[PDB]
Amino acid sequence: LHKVSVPLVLALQYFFPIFHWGSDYSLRLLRSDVVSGLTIASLAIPQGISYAKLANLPPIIGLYSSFVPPLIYSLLGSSRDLAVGPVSIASLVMGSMLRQAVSPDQEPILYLQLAFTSTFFAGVFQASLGFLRLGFIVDFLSKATLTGFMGGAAIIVSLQQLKGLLAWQTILMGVAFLAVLLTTRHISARNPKLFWVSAAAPLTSVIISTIISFVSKAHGISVIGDLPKGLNPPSANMLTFSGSYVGLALNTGIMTGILSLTEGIAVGRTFASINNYQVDGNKEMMAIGVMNMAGSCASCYVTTGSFSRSAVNYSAGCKTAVSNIVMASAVLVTLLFLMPLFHYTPNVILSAIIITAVIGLIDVRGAARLWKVDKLDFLACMAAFLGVLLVSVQMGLAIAVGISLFKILLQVTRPNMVVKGVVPGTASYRSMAQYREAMRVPSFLVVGVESAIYFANSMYLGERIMRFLREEDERAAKCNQCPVRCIILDMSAVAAIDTSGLDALAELKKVLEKRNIELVLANPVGSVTERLYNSVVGKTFGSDRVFFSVAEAVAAAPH
Template identity: 30%
Template sequence: MPGLDVPATYQREWFGKDIIAGVVLATLLVPQGMAYAELAGLPTITGLYTTILCLLAYAVFGPSRILVLGPDSALGPMIAATVLPLIASDGDPQKAVALASMLALMVGLIMVLASVAKFGFIADLISKPTMIGYMNGLAITILVGQLPKLFGFKVDSDTFVGDFVGFVQGVANGETVVAAAAVGIAGIVLILALQQWLPKVPAVLVMVVLAIVATTVFDLASRGVSLVGELPRGFPPFTIPRVELSDIGLMFAGALGIALVSLTDTISNSSAFAARSGQEVHGNQEMIGIGAANLAAGFFQGFPVSTSGSRTAVAERSGAKTQLTGVTGAVLVLLMLVLLPGLFRNLPQPALAAVVITASVSLADIPGTVRLWRQSKAEFSLSLAAFLGVAFLGVLPGIGIAVGLSILNIFRRAWWPYETVIGRVPGYEGFHDVNFHPDAKHLPGLVIYRWDAPVFFANVKPFRDNIRQLARTEPKPRWILLAAEPITDVDTTAADVLIELDRELDAQGTSLVFAELKHRVKDKIELYGLKQEIDPHHFYPTLDAAVAAYVALTGATWSTED
């Protein structure tokens, strides 16, 4: 519990900065908490319950000094995609809250168990290109899903295509509430303008206050604009969520996806902010902190949480030094619920949609996508596939596609690695790639081949076929010398194929020779019996030693140009 160690090292001059930062943070926590609860398909009050408990729990168990956890725009659609299909057709909000709370408990347990098992590396399962595509897909899905609310009507759909078609049809059929659209669009413009030109001003709070004022002055409720209404008064109630056992099994895949996205987001944000303050990132302790935050939220009618980069940035800019900032924000939100539950009753629903839409815009990484297109068409294709998976198959399948594509990309790189023939280049020491140095020289009868990957069951056949092709070139090589330094591993399947290949080449009058094998790989080769099958004189410590042995054996010489 890192938070318990803070008092021993706390400096008096930090107190005022933490309190001020906590007050500023609270102005952001309330509207965003309510908006992201709506995004998850839950009552707005659950967003505030979640905010309070996760901040308090992370303050005790989280290792970062200023990281801010809470309801997140990236998790909202995942929670909705997991919970809403399990709710009865009447959309029972109590069942929705119970399912979301159980989902938070499941995510919390997954995080804690993963931390105990030292599985912090799981955050690396999603590559940056696929994460960019996933977030872009999430951004467009959230934006389109909020458009009907922004325009004052509802669409009965839970897919991107359905939301888009329903929105277009609603607008075409005249269902738009003009006052609602005006409030929502003005809210978006105001938030984006303030964030662009006055970044230190709490843009969301300013928009929310002006929207409440507009509701009161122009009586927007009588013009068909939906309002948040009075919130329940009092402390978040301790509740053990009651759900059907069959529902838990159906929620498990969603919990895994949420845990993965939350962990990836938290580790990346933690690393970024730790680098600025000189702290170290403790991945497994972060998992404990996120797990504790989710468990606390789950027992008080909350839902799964993650790190918020925007709220953490606000806390940092406001002078936050420790988690006292988050505790201050949580206490202020709690005081609002106890003393002023009606403070946001006149807040228009389109204003909350504006908060969510502006948050979704920040999820998209268009410059990153353009950079991928310029730098690597293959990785751009991975990003595009993840984007399309989220947009057209749904959020949960989208995260599955993102993880699957990342793993397949790793496998592809090992399956079809870079391979080349190398030779001597006049004026340069050592041996160099003929693809970049077409003028590279070769000794007659000697081919030096490099394979930049482990040799294992999935790629040993392409490896074998490449060497067979080299053996068929004219003039026929006497040696095929394998520059084996990039080969980091050989499995039993590959060892068997290498033995067969060596016998096949020997029968053709060509020797397979190895140079620069790593000690670990050499030990494995001995264990597999390759050294008993392959001539022990065909193993050399360096390429130069192997080439010198070939020259001594054949009398071959380099051309006079060298």
């Protein structure tokens, strides 16, 4: 028999990780972060400007958002491969939530007061979700939920940019560079060695088209024009905590503060497992969020770790988070010296960078792939696609997160319970539905409940055991066999058990004792055994009714 057991220097290093990994910084790591930082401050200048236009902001707000939030994260960040900048989904939702209350064309100054207050309210939401150690609710945002959302929100932006839109080389320069940017993101999606042609394609589209426009003073082509040369102007005089639009700037902060958090705490997770290092998650949510609310005071909008630039970062050989300093050192140059060179860049070119980032969100293949595999993840993909397209954008991320949390509760409530039997030649007791080889011991009924025993199922697992008990007490009467005299609960799959779960196991042990059947638990789990040996309802089982395995509960014969 086997017994069942029970189970100021630090202040600038617990808050600022740059004093920890700054000790191992070589010049071989500076050669690797300069190449991967100048590769990444070549996808940041054209796509930061582009995603600021997608958020209906001035195009320099995306370049302000590639200087100070990359510098703040390099002080507070825990990931070596994460790249900080404006993000295509956070810009598309911010520019759709603020478009329908404040017009960006007629009220410009009021529009650059709710883009900065929403960034602050996204900052104080992300920071006060990792400070309260409450970051696991960004894992409730499934990949199926973010397929109908990004795709149900990529249409209502395409509809809003279809009402306000109503020459000829404007059409041809917007469709030629839509064929340079769409086939090249297909070349790099196939071969993961030609990443460099898609990292260079937005900057080459900006550079080449500016030549075909200075060479014309091309009329029939709009042009960015003069952009204000200099660093970030001090905001937080544009942070409106009082007025009519403080519930709109708050609704955009808890909306672009979630979608920016399911991208930055999902790309710091991706590259921590490839390169084998430890990222905290909650300290990463305090980093992205002090980044936002201190960038909100420096004329930036919502930034996080982008999916696209971080993959370019870990394809050019980044080693530390100094690739976010070399990024913000070629953004510092272009904010101080290279600003008159955007005077002839057309708006249709960085409208094509928007289109490849919008139709790169409409993923219909993986939404149809979500129908062949699961069907409650297809319901969550179509409750976000049809909850954003018809009803507001808040209730498309609430009726799809709520029914993704429901399919978890639909398995904890009403779980699978199986009748197990011994596999011949083996002391292992597997289920008798799977494993047709498994035959049953004559005077025993091995039942395995495959979930944690909570309040939500503890009365269902008492009416299912007795349905199992009624069937085998009637099958043994049709086959000249002995009745059930020991019910063994295989607790191998019981994750946890609460006070309503232990009480249902003691109101089952004494109901089965009146019919002389002797309930016995076998193979408990740690966090259940310490719940069973530290309770007054766990001494009604004791040491004679808790066993090492099912084969040891059969061999002891509790009768």
